[PDB]
Design a protein around this nucleic acid. Structure first.
Lengths: 92, 88, 91, 91, 91, 92
DNA sequence: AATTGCTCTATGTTAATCGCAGAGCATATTT
DNA sequence: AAATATGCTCTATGATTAACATAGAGCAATT
């Protein structure tokens, strides 16, 4: 699948997506996009996948739809983040 | 469905390996990262076309290594990778 | 909200999907996409949702991912199907 | 377009709407939203289209605008209702 | 290994692509593949080589991407091609 | 398969061999190698493929192994060459 | 000359990036 | 009170390409 493009040399689009939720805790699909530079279509495409994977859950208030990392989604993040520190430390 | 490349791309694992070793063969580049060989070369052909890597054929032995340009990309991207973790 | 749908006016693409899951039980994405004429891409984005609700389960078979309707999905299926005869009947 | 969402799993909002007019003859855009469980803005949206496609026509009842199906409407209902059965044929 | 080429038995798919850019000036991934009848994958993968050598360059026209031979690329397409005629006149 | 390479940019080794056989008429394995500069292990490999399709047949003229074209390899020689021309022609 | 072996090529199946056209609903408008 | 222009948000899905596996094939070295 299209994973390594000129825009995602090292990190994938979902990476920045999750890293964002880790901070804001909860955010709108639009808020995720404009804050990560990742185009909206790519965001929800990965959000749909995150939902099916149980990493992220959807919240709704009639009109306002928010997304947040589930406990396992937070487990995934704090796991992949440790592979980064490795990459970069083994490295230098 | 990629469970293998969640946060990191296979391209990264390749760039990094060519940093700690400097000179590596498409076969070893694959093994030491557990990335399917067919992906290695396919990414190599792209890295070559972008001057991020230069080939060095010492006979029948093939060797791919980072260039001055590719090295800059390596030390550049990696920094971006850290700053993203710092705040988190 | 300018509407133009010559394809989905009464039935959603998600419906045809659910249905095909009852016949074959388990099938790949590139598979049900052909037996329903529903474009492959649309299928994935819909099977994901069915996974997010637990209406379907991902069962890999070697290298090819297989999607099979679950109990809760079977419920949704048979339950929402009767909801359709409760309409056709009176009309 | 936005066909299948959380509320709509099998049938689109149009299916219901028409199914409503196919039982109440002519009802106000409000009274449809009342029975269809569909929000007001959505119904108006589908109506603005139904009328533009010669599927539905207004009927001026004085100080109100009850909406009634047209001959083109039944030409669509029964013509759509059959894709359901051809579909729910294997249950 | 073993040999079974049904197509490229005398010419490389690289030969075609090179020839194309020499008469078209500017071509995209699809264009080459569509005309040369060489499969898309082979093309996109061969340009990489023509780029790693500096024989071809990239013309970014908005979204779509074009490819054109370079100085060294031209001095290659006009040289090797001569060893073609030097080869056919040997008869 | 391994078709395009650093040397076989335009023509393949099977091209050099065949087109050279027409002129030279006939020759031994190593002879082909020396002339077209193509390594033996390569020349010998493709010859095996030629002796398999009938394009070329080996004829024991002494103790060496003489490799000379055939009819199957003639219908092909002119066939490929014809396309080779269709290519350099439109280049104009 | 034939088999073994390593490496890179040709290329199809699948999938994931990002775009355009929808379309579901909520507000602010509006005769 | 009911209707529309309007602003979001997510869906339908086509086009480009990457992930990567199969079948080659250029080229030593061994049998």
């Amino acid at each position: 699948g299209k994973i390594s493009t000129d825009k995602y040399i090292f990190l994938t689009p979902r990476a920045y997506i999750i890293v964002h939720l880790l901070k804001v805790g909860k955010a709108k699909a639009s808020e995720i996009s404009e804050n990560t530079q990742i185009p909206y279509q790519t965001v929800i495409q990965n959000i749909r996948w995150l939902l099916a994977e149980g990493y992220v859950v959807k919240e709704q208030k009639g009109e306002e739809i928010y997304y947040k990392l589930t406990d396992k989604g937070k487990q995934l993040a704090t796991a992949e983040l440790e592979k980064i520190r490795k990459l970069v430390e083994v490295v230098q």
